[PDB]
Ligand binder design. Sequence first.
Ligand SMILES: Cn1cc(-c2nc[nH]c2-c2ccc(F)cc2)ccc1=O
Ligand SMILES: Cn1cc(-c2nc[nH]c2-c2ccc(F)cc2)ccc1=O
Lengths: 112, 113
Amino acid sequence: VTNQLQYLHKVVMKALWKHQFAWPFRQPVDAVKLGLPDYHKIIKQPMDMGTIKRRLENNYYWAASECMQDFNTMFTNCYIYNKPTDDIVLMAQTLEKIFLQKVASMPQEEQE
Amino acid sequence: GRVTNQLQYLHKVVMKALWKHQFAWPFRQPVDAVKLGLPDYHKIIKQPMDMGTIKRRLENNYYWAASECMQDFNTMFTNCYIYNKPTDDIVLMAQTLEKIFLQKVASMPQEEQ
Ligand SMILES: Cn1cc(-c2nc[nH]c2-c2ccc(F)cc2)ccc1=O
Ligand SMILES: Cn1cc(-c2nc[nH]c2-c2ccc(F)cc2)ccc1=O
C-alpha cells in the first residue's frame, strides 16, 4: 500500500471501471470470442482493467509507476492492434484522457 | 495562459529527459508527410503533435494546466501507435519515450500553483 496506489485504486480505477466506454477493457481480449486469430501474434503483453483492479485489491504493485505502466500497456495494445477508424480506439482515447487528467493530481511522493 | 509549478516540471524535468533521448529525434519536429513520403498521414492523423510544438507551447505560456500539456504528449504517442505498423521501430521508440514520460509525470508536484 502507498498513498499513490490508493489514489490509482480509489480515484483512477473507480472513475474508469464504471465508465460507459469501459466494458471492452474490463476483462482480457478473448481472440476466440471476438474472432481475432492474429491478436496474440501482434500483442505480446495483454492487459485489461480487470487484471489491474485485482492487482490493486491484492497489493500486487510495489510502485505507482508499475500500475500506471499497466494502464498505458492496456491503451497502447488497443491503438496498435485496432484500425485507426475503429470505435474501440475512440473509447480508448476517452478513457486515457480521464486516466491522464487524474494522474496530473496524483500525490507527488510515494510515501508507504 | 499562465505559469505553474507542474508546467515548470513538465518543461524542465519531463521534456528535458525525453528531448535528449536517443529515440527522441523522430518526435522533436512535426511529421513532414511530403519529405518522409507518407501521403496518407494527414488523412489518418487529424491532430498532429510533436515535442517541438509542446516545447514552444510551454515557452510561450500556451497551457493553463499541466493536464492540457500531458494530453498533447498523449496525442503525440497515440498518433505514432495509430498510424505506423505494429512491427515498425518507431512504435518501439514511442513506447520507450512514453514509459519515461509516465515515470516522470508520477513524480510531478501534487497540487497546481
Ligand atoms: C481491448 N479490445 C477490446 C475488444 C473488445 N472487447 C469486447 N468487445 C470488443 C470488440 C468487439 C467487436 C468490435 F468490433 C470491437 C471491439 C476488441 C479489441 C481490443 O483491442
Ligand atoms: C512520429 N513519426 C515520425 C516519423 C519520422 N520523423 C522523422 N523521421 C521519421 C521516420 C522516417 C522513416 C522511417 F522509416 C521511420 C521514421 C515517422 C513516423 C511517425 O509517426
